[PDB]
Amino acid sequence: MPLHMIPQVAHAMVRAAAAGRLTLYTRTRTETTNFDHAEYVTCGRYTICAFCLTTLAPHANVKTIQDSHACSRQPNEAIRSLVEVSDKAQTA
Amino acid sequence: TYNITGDGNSFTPTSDMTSTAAPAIDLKPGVLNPTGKLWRPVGTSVATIDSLAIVSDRFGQYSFVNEGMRETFSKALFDINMWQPLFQATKTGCGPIVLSSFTTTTSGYVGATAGDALDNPVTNGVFISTVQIMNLQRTIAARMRDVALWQKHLDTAMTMLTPDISAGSASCNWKSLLAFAKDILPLDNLCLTYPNEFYNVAIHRYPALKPGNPDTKLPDAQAHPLGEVAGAFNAATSEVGSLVGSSSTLSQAISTMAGKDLDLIEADTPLPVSVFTPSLAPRSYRPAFIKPEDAKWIAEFNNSSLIRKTLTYSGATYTVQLGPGPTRVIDMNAMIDSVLTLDVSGTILPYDTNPDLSTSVPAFVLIQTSVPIQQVTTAANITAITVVSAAGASAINLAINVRGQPRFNMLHLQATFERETITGIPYIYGLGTFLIPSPTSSSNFSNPTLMDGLLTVTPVLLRETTYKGEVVDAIVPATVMANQTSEEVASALANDAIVLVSNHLNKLANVVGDAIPVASRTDDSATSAIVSRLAVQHKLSQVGQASPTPPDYPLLWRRAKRAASMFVSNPSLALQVGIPVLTQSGMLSALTSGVGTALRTGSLGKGVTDASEKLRARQSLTVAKQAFFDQIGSLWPGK
Amino acid sequence: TYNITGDGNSFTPTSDMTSTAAPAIDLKPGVLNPTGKLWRPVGTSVATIDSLAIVSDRFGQYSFVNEGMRETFSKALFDINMWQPLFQATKTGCGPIVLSSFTTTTSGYVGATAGDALDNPVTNGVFISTVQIMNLQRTIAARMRDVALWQKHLDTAMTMLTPDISAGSASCNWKSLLAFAKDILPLDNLCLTYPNEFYNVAIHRYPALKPGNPDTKLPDAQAHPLGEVAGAFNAATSEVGSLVGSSSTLSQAISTMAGKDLDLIEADTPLPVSVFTPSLAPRSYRPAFIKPEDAKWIAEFNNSSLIRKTLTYSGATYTVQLGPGPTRVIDMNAMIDSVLTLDVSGTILPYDTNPDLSTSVPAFVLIQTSVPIQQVTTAANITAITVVSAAGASAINLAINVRGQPRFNMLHLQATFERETITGIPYIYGLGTFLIPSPTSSSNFSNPTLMDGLLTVTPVLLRETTYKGEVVDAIVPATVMANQTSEEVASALANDAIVLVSNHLNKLANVVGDAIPVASRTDDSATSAIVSRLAVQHKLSQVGQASPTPPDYPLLWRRAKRAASMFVSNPSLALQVGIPVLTQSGMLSALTSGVGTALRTGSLGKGVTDASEKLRARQSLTVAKQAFFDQIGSLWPGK
Amino acid sequence: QVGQASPTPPDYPLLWRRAKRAASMFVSNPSLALQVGIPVLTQSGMLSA
């Protein structure tokens, strides 16, 4: 799984983010809590990889850019978490 | 050359004179050779026979020239020659090549290998150089590309009122034709600039056509160029349509027999997959109303148990609700390697009356347990329920819901069924279902589940085709016989003996229909192969008065056309249980073999019926063409 | 031989030098002959001319040898010779055969028959013996099977970094390539044991490749073996891609035209079934929403009557309930011979609200009455209601019932429709229905019946194809024209003129697309045949000022591409009512005939567009190959 | 890379087997060539080859 129809499946990803439940899983650790670029975000079978923004495999062994891929979706991460939060516990 | 705009010119299209040119020639590699490269006894006198060095490849002296290739090639040059006056006028390097000049003397030893060549010396023959052929070809190609506009233009004319009477003979005022041509034809044509040339050429190619008025005395002739020869072979005879035709046709049939290698069918005991199997395609099966009894890889769980509430996701629940005919259990326990292409559309059928309408998806779940399905009564049993196939596993109203409809949008699901992933042992199952996170009311939605669409097995692993659930390196046609119900066949994986055999069998049929006159009720001697097997088989002798069967020859013969005809009409019947006499593989072996001999030494089969009919239709065609031309004569009686 | 592991060796793959060997040769029977067996005047002196006996077939002196076969065969021997050093080293009987030794003197009379042979004596030529050819072949076959491993191995190399530039020229460090090969290649290869031989051979086959360092002075040459010749013909020219290609292509088109025998289309008045019809397949039709008006063999009973309760079994009852659109009435009154393959799935639709849910089956019932359907108002009328098609005629919930669904399992029903069974007279009907033994409440289940699935007619009797309900020994294409609606076509039995014609017409189309440049908007002179018919037909003359049509040549020409294109895009349109200009069979006859001439004398059609494009693509390919090799150069700059 | 690059025991077993697999997939359905996300056939080079 190399990603196809990129902007759309991206769409979908983000829709999971927007409704809090996004499977944000880097190798061993279940959520990309800290900014350690995910490996498996289940976009209806499409395992999204934050490592490359693409899927399954990282772009390089340059953990700086790879994390940067991650950092890029700082909006996605933040929204996901945030929506979870609000839809659980928030501003009294 | 003669003024085209003259009188005396015949417009006689005849069968005898069927247009032809030289459109393309044979250039098969095999065919290029003949043969021996030319060599020398080192270079010293007649002593060194033991040793040869090839002549001067350097810039000249090569091999003994291909007799056929020379002859062919010279012919090719003659095509261009057909337009010589025109080339010349176009100033386009017209000068007729004279191939012969290229074909230069080679003198010494002839052979393929030094080996062979040592033995044979051939004094003062001919070679051609790589270089030379390079430059020769170059010229010819160039010539062709110069004519490419001309050819087209010539063609247009020849169709714009087509001089082609394939059958018999037509005649009409050429003048009339010609003048209407020039009254109707587009100005932008090369034909209108070059009338005189085009016509000349035409005349030179089409013996069917005569010059204007050159000597109005004698505008017409019976001797034309070479053409003629080739034409006689395309012209319809007393007993056959086309000689080339029937010859070609039959030869295509042979060669397909050749490629099949016959033997294929007469295989009981292991014939290797790779050998028997060509190229394979995916197939499409249903859950729905498939039959557990028949369907090896796809059976069902049985009513009564009830495995209702199962956790599906993180603290999220769906009632798989296992009881009365819950979709199907896809038995992918070492059933080759496939991709479970689930193609859901239509079917959604919203939960009974649950506000769990949103969050419910068409999904695939594989079940991975050492507890055989019939034992699976509680949650404990399952081992593994793995939801494989859902993607975004929530929901949206993809159903055409506006007008009340519960049509679900077309989904494409994938489950990479690689048996290596699991390697057996916790035997492999899968189910189909509208799976939810959002908890479903078990009491409410009493239906187990009704996710009924398509399941398009992708048999990826063209390696090692299955004989009836048996993953074998063997394809055994003759034993497949009478061991398959229609249901079974339908059910069967793509990767399975049955379809492969039919594909091969379809080529046999093809042959039979085109070549042997098994068309509308023609019982021919050709059909004798099957009857001879039948005749000997019927030797039902008892004591006293044995079977009083008035000899096989009418009786069985007619029965055997009938069953041939049934084979022909649908090839699969061969594989289908309970077919009177084809159930006997002997007869199919007999047919298979039989045909080839029948092609081989058949005295070129031309059905009497069809002859007469073709004759008649042909004539009537010509009539109406005449009448057309007549109308053209009427509307512009050109000069 | 030279050390392979040296410097100077070129890696120059060129179009000029396209790999080739001799993979297979022509061995057509026809081709085996040339010709005359050798005979003798009894055996006494020159007197007995009247009488000939064949020479000594016994153990020798046979026929005058096939010139072509000799030439061919010797070539074949040369293949083996290409590996002589290797054979020799393998100790595998290497010794080059020398075919010539086998070709032994025959001296006397030459002819096919005693007849013919009497006339012709040919002194001191050559024969070959049955025995001899036996043993010769034996050797060659053996040679081949000894090389079978080698060939493969050779091939692998040649693909594992493929030296094949089909277009133009590539170059890269052979050294580099070679060393990466030997750094990457599997150890178990024969190539790694036999480097020196394989390379030598390679070099001997692939003029595209040069030896190592043999004289680093001169490692390279321009003269290679014979190869070359055949290569030039596969190499792309100025105006054409491949010479062989286009030649072959066109010839395949011809021969398909040949086999069709053209004439086929120009048939008004009886052309015999057998002749026109090849091989036939079953088709699939629906009850459902088919149209009684159009569908010859399948119409409906009309709302208003009500034949509700009919005894079905022994003291057992079903309401057939005959009224508002009761499924369909299958009109199998002498409608050739078929097998009514009823394929029911989905449809069960349980009785309204009857506890007659169990015992209700999907069935077929034939109705056998001399009372025409519209007269059939009470039970009295029926004559015969025979329930034919149900098998176990009770029921079980085969419907996917769990989730509310009334999906009925896939059933296969059969009704052997053999009109001979009845032979007309009580005209033949049939219906479809959920038939019960267990009595159904007429008041309740007011619906007549709704057994709506598939009906796959199996037209078994490939004997005598039907022209539009008319069971005739005739297939008449030209009259079929404009007498068929889309509906009718769809409806029509498998055994019917229409589809047969299209099948033939599809081969015409195939030809046209591949050979004639009727691709994206290219109006070619070739298209002239249709226009010429159009042009003459348009002679709509009145009084005074007739039709002021600016000559046909732009006008009609463009209209006629349009409609050609429509034919090409869907062949069936030819048979479909209301098609502007194709409705005129004349134009289809014109096209049909027209094409053949167009192939015949066409100056090998190479679309200018496509040429340039192929050129460009080809170049860019080569570029990227270069770049690949480059990368390979980078990663292991082999020596 | 730098230092220890990809330690791939030569292509010849490895990639060879992978490549039969994907050939076989091509053969079994030709359309896969056009279909996104196919491991190694996605590279048009190999299809040209």
CA distance B203 to C301: 66
With a CB cutoff of 8 Å and minimum separation 6, the contacts of C498 are C480, C484, C489, C492, C575
Size of the A and B interface in Cβ pairs below 8 Å: 18
Phi and psi torsions of B274, nearest 5°: -55, -40
What stretches of C119-242 show up as alpha helix (H) in DSSP?
130-160, 174-184, 190-193, 195-205, 228-234
Judged by 3 or more CB pairs under 8 A, whether B touches D is: yes
Q: CA neighbours within 13 Å on the CB side: how many for C218?
A: 4
Question: At B336, which amino acid appears?
Answer: I
Residue A11: closest C-alpha in chain B:
B392
With a CB cutoff of 8 Å and minimum separation 6, the contacts of C33 are C66
Tell how strand C361-368 and strand B121-127 pair up: unpaired
CA distance C253 to C507: 9
Give the C window 169-198 contacts with D, CB below 8 Å. Answer: 183-187
**Beta-bridge mates of residue B495:** none
Mutate which: C532, C555, C589, vs B, most B CBs within 10 A? C532
Residue A5: closest C-alpha in chain D:
D36
Query: How do the domains of chain A map onto residue ranges?
Result: 3-88
CB C235 within 8 Å of CB C16: yes
CB C357 within 8 Å of CB C350: yes
Residues of A with CB under 8 A from a CB of D: 1-5, 61
CA distance B570 to B592: 16
Residue B459, chain D, CB below 8 Å: the answer is yes
CB contact under 8 A, D45 and C628: yes
Q: What is the resolution of this structure in A?
A: 4.5
**Beta-bridge mates of residue C125:** C106
Q: CA neighbours within 13 Å on the CB side: how many for B319?
A: 21
- Candidates C476, C417, C459; CA nearest to C280 is C459
Residue D6: closest C-alpha in chain C:
C635
CA distance B501 to B484: 13
Using DSSP's 3-state secondary structure scheme, residue B531 falls into: helix
Residue B540, chain D, CB below 8 Å: the answer is no
Q: State the sign of the Cα–Cα–Cα–Cα dihedral B337, B341, B347, B353.
A: positive
The maximal CA–CA distance of chain C, rounded, in angstroms, is 109
CB C294 within 8 Å of CB C487: yes
DSSP labels, B158-209: HHHT----SSSB----HHHHHHHHHHHS-TTSHHHHSHHHHHHHHHHH-TTB
- Helices C174-184 and C608-635: crossing angle, nearest 10°? 70
B475 Ramachandran zone, left/alpha/beta (phi>0; psi -120 to 50): beta
Residue D28, chain B, CB below 8 Å: the answer is yes
Using DSSP's 3-state secondary structure scheme, residue C40 falls into: strand
The DSSP letter of residue D14 is H
Tell me which chain D residues have a C-beta less than 8 angstroms from the C-beta of B339: none
CB contact under 8 A, D36 and A61: no
CB contact under 8 A, A2 and D42: yes
What are B217's two structure tokens?
């005395």
Cis peptide upstream of residue B35 (ω within 30 degrees of 0): yes
CA distance C390 to C361: 7
CA distance B344 to B454: 6
Pseudo-torsion of CA B110, B115, B116, B119, nearest 10°? 80
Distance from CA of A71 to the nearest CA of D (A): 25
C-alpha separations of B26 from B244, B255, B376, C21, C556 in Å: 16, 18, 69, 17, 38
Distance of CA A4 to the CA centre of its chain: 17
- Candidates C571, C535, C564; CA nearest to C552 is C535
Instruction: Give the burial string for B310-331 (b: 16+ CB within 10 Å, else e).
Output: bebeeeebbbbbbbbbbbbbbb
Q: State the sign of the Cα–Cα–Cα–Cα dihedral B428, B432, B438, B441.
A: negative
State the burial class of residue C504 (Cβ atoms within 10 Å of its Cβ: 0-12, 13-18, 19+): buried
Tell me which chain C residues have a C-beta less than 8 angstroms from the C-beta of B137: 232, 237
Residue D4, chain B, CB below 8 Å: the answer is no
Distance of CA B6 to the CA centre of its chain: 51
Tell me which chain C residues have a C-beta less than 8 angstroms from the C-beta of D20: none
Tell me which chain D residues have a C-beta less than 8 angstroms from the C-beta of B459: 28
CB contact under 8 A, B609 and C272: yes
Residue D35: closest C-alpha in chain A:
A4
CB C163 within 8 Å of CB C208: yes
CA distance A39 to B69: 65
Pseudo-torsion of CA C385, C390, C394, C397, nearest 10°? -130
CB B434 within 8 Å of CB B444: no
**Beta-bridge mates of residue B330:** B298
C-alpha separations of B46 from B53, B54, B107, B595 in Å: 14, 16, 14, 58
Residues of B with CB under 8 A from a CB of A: 389-394, 414
- Candidates C469, C470, C449; CA nearest to C300 is C449
What are A62's two structure tokens?
């340059």
CA distance C358 to C399: 11
CB B65 within 8 Å of CB C105: no
Distance from CA of C157 to the nearest CA of D (A): 11
For tokens 């072979």, the residue is B233
Residue D21: closest C-alpha in chain B:
B461
- Candidates C263, C600, C556, C530; CA nearest to B162 is C530
For tokens 């390279």, the residue is C220
Residue D8: closest C-alpha in chain C:
C184
Distance from CA of D22 to the nearest CA of A (A): 14
Sheet containing strand C454-458, strands side by side: C283-285, C454-458, C339-347, C407-415
Residue D5: closest C-alpha in chain C:
C635
Distance of CA C105 to the CA centre of its chain: 47
Using DSSP's 3-state secondary structure scheme, residue C363 falls into: strand
CB contact under 8 A, D49 and C185: no
